[PDB]
């Protein structure tokens, strides 16, 4: 719907004081321009549709760059498979947009963009590659080799991508064990007790679960070519059906780790005179 | 008319004569767990007037060089009677809070305090090692902690301090302190009011959580304007906190939790 219209107002001389207020009470003065100056009648057709939380989180964002190699396993120890633990906190833009709020609850849509490259094209040529993206939930076994038994995917979800295709896209529901996700957790996983040793009872400040959403395992299905081929798969993450619950100020310094810590990049504001416009 | 209030909970009574108003955080009064939102199945215990009463913490002193103070709930009430005993005996706990800050001064004094109630008030550490602050320093109790003026890095790798280093313009968490007013808040301005009242409901991503492991609310007192009095050499006025739990319920009863303190 549209915004409320500007009602016309004439001059005022009365006991009403809308301009005077008290911000000690913790409230914003709910003033409109007719309370201070004379206004005309304006029919407003502007809407707040783009400023909704769904439209704010409608754009996908890159969260990981996972790198795999296709090579003979006998030389130079190439990365025939690689595993990435799922988090948003290693890229700063989606982390800042999420850490505008404390609690959140959304479905999530993943998108995978794969690019390949030749290290040296003089060694030969290689065919079209097939990429397997295996979800590892927390508790499921981790692959140790690229041809391990864990890649059979009897219960783990898996996406097979042929190179040159449109990018692979899946969706997940709300998978949190709480009633909302927690962007901030003011606490510990375990409480130390009296009389026990110093090595027992320690935990991180704000970690909660150490393996909360699991890991993604990426490999190349095909056998080794004489050429070394490197591949990067980029994970794009888009929230949808979003509800948020506690507003927070946005981050003003560079991030330092998964927590709220800071080391450098302080003193962010520049120099500007008080009486210079 | 508005400037007088009388709060009563349990056997405790607070009367103020220069109040601004009372803030209910996010428009929600504290309440018990409804049957449509109840996750544990055992019968809760509700101590009522044994726990829902005003407890007075230690008094901090405001002076010119002071940069701020902070507290954690329900960590600040862990030694305060039957609420602390019901917290330490039970695995799960839920309580709303009424936070009352008291700071009086003469009409010739000036200064302003920002009383901020922060859900999940995480604080930054003192070292390069991430999330390394221990339980004993992150839960100080009724004494709270103090905001600092500048960031100082702990270089002791042999015996690290493992403490917070909260810088007051960075609000302890790297956010600008002028934007901390999106939290539910009141201002104690000494020409205007001598008290601030915040009513905080239970805010979490769960219906009930472990109180010993997790702090739901944090109370931050920061001087928005510095204290000054009559251009003399020194002045020092006190600040007193009085916090009452509201709508307490506890579920999982077992033996006592004695946390490690050092």
């Amino acid at each position: 719907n549209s915004l409320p219209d500007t009602k016309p107002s004439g001059p005022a001389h009365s006991k009403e004081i809308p301009a005077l207020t008290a911000v000690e009470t913790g409230a914003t003065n709910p003033l409109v321009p007719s309370d201070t100056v004379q206004t005309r009648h304006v029919i407003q057709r502007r809407t707040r549709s783009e400023s909704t939380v769904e439209s704010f989180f409608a754009r996908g964002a890159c969260v990981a760059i996972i790198e795999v190699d296709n090579d003979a396993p006998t030389k130079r120890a190439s990365r025939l498979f690689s595993v990435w633990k799922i988090t948003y906190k290693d890229t700063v833009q989606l982390r800042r947009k999420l850490e505008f709020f404390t609690y959140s609850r959304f479905d999530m849509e993943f998108t995978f963009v794969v690019t390949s490259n030749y290290i040296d094209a003089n060694n030969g040529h290689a065919l079209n590659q097939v990429y397997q993206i295996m979800y590892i939930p927390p508790g499921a076994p981790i692959p140790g080799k690229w041809n391990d038994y864990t890649w059979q995917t009897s219960s783990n979800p898996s996406v097979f991508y042929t190179y040159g295709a449109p990018p692979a896209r899946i969706s997940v529901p709300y998978v949190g064990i709480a009633n909302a996700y927690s962007h901030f957790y003011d606490g510990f996983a375990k409480v130390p007790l009296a009389g026990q040793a110093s090595t027992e009872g320690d935990s991180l400040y704000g970690a909660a679960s150490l393996n909360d959403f699991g890991s993604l395992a990426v490999r190349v299905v095909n056998d080794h070519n004489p050429t070394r081929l490197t591949s990067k798969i980029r994970v794009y993450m888009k929230p949808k059906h979003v509800r948020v619950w506690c507003p927070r100020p946005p981050r003003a310094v560079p991030y330092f780790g998964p927590g709220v810590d800071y080391k450098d990049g302080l003193t962010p504001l520049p120099e500007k005179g008080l009486t210079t416009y | 008319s508005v400037r007088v209030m009388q709060l009563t909970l349990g056997n405790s009574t607070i009367t103020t004569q220069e109040a601004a108003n009372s803030v209910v955080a996010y428009g929600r009064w504290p309440e018990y767990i409804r049957d449509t939102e109840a996750n544990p199945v055992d019968q809760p215990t509700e101590p009522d007037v044994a726990a829902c009463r005003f407890y007075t913490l230690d008094t901090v002193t405001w002076r010119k060089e002071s940069r701020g103070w902070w507290w954690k709930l329900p960590d600040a009430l862990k030694d305060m009677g039957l609420f602390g005993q019901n917290m330490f005996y039970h695995y799960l706990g839920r309580a709303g809070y009424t936070v009352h800050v008291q700071c009086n001064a003469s009409k010739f004094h000036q200064g302003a305090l920002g009383v901020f109630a922060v859900p999940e008030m995480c604080l930054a550490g003192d070292s390069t090692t991430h999330m390394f602050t221990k339980y004993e320093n992150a839960n100080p109790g009724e004494k709270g902690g103090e905001f600092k003026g500048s960031f100082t890095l702990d270089t002791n790798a042999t015996n690290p301090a493992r403490n917070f280093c909260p810088v007051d313009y960075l609000f302890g968490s790297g956010v600008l302190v002028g934007n901390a007013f999106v939290y539910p808040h009141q201002i104690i301005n000494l020409r205007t009011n001598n008290c601030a009242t915040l009513v905080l409901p239970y805010v979490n991503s769960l219906s009930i959580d472990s109180m010993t492991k997790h702090n739901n609310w944090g109370i931050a007192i920061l001087p928005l304007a510095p204290l000054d009095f009559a251009t003399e050499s020194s002045t020092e006025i006190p600040i007193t906190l009085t916090i009452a739990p509201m709508c307490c319920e506890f579920n999982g009863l077992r033996n006592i939790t004695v946390p490690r303190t050092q």
Partner: antibody
């Protein structure tokens, strides 16, 4: 991976030299680990010649400076002042065995797998 | 700040032994970059386990590794006389500092 020499002097600064292959110089990181006799291993620092970034241990932050030379594919380590506890065997190692776990979300972690024959330095009068 | 290992482990040939490496949080208990090294006298250290349960090529299959909390364990099943030497634990600390263990001498009885 070859080590330069073996030296001895109290007090004054001692410069180390480690020459590697030209592929491994530009691609992988080079690590320094020292070993006192019977006292186990001790990490000293890292030189990464692809970007000339240095990370030092907190025990050796003030004393140890590391440089690189692209013309000879050789990295160097200088201890600015030496004490009698620094009598040890100093290894030069190349980190080329990678992890399957992605370091942060954009990088690859490497373990040491190729180790040099070492350098013995004695600090005694 | 160094990682904790027992000073000596002893065993007969044919038996199954376990060398334990206990670190802390922001360490073994946080990362999966836990590795093991083997050093015979006069030799450079040789990698025998690189990721937590994984072996490099050429390492014999009697070596195995595991992790439980802040503790990583190296298990040798079917001990032989050629396994006599020092075993070193290695992991990654969260302040980008790499840190070794104290070392465990293995004596084959």
């Amino acid at each position: 991976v070859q080590s330069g020499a073996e030296l001895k002097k109290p007090g004054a600064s001692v410069k180390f030299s480690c020459q590697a292959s030209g592929f491994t110089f530009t691609t992988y990181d080079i690590h320094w680990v020292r070993q006192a006799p019977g006292q186990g291993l001790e990490w000293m620092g890292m030189i990464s010649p692809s970007r000339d970034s240095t990370i030092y241990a907190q025990k050796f932050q003030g004393r140890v400076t590391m440089t690189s030379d692209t013309s000879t594919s050789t990295v160097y380590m200088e201890l600015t002042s030496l004490r009698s506890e620094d009598t040890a065997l100093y290894y030069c190692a190349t980190a080329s065995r990678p992890s399957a776990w992605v370091f942060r979300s954009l990088y690859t972690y490497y373990y040491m797998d190729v180790w040099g024959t070492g350098t013995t330095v004695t600090v005694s009068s | 700040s160094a990682l904790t290992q027992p000073a000596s482990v002893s065993g007969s040939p044919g038996q199954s032994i376990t060398i334990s490496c206990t670190g802390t949080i922001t360490d073994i208990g946080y990362y999966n970059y836990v590795s093991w090294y083997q050093q015979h006298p006069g030799k450079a250290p040789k990698l025998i386990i690189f990721d937590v349960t994984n072996r490099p090529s050429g390492v014999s299959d009697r070596f195995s590794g595991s992790k439980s909390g802040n503790t990583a364990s190296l298990t040798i099943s079917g001990l032989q006389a050629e396994d006599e030497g020092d075993y070193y634990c290695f992991s990654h600390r969260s302040n980008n500092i790499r840190v070794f263990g104290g070392g465990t001498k293995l004596t084959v009885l």
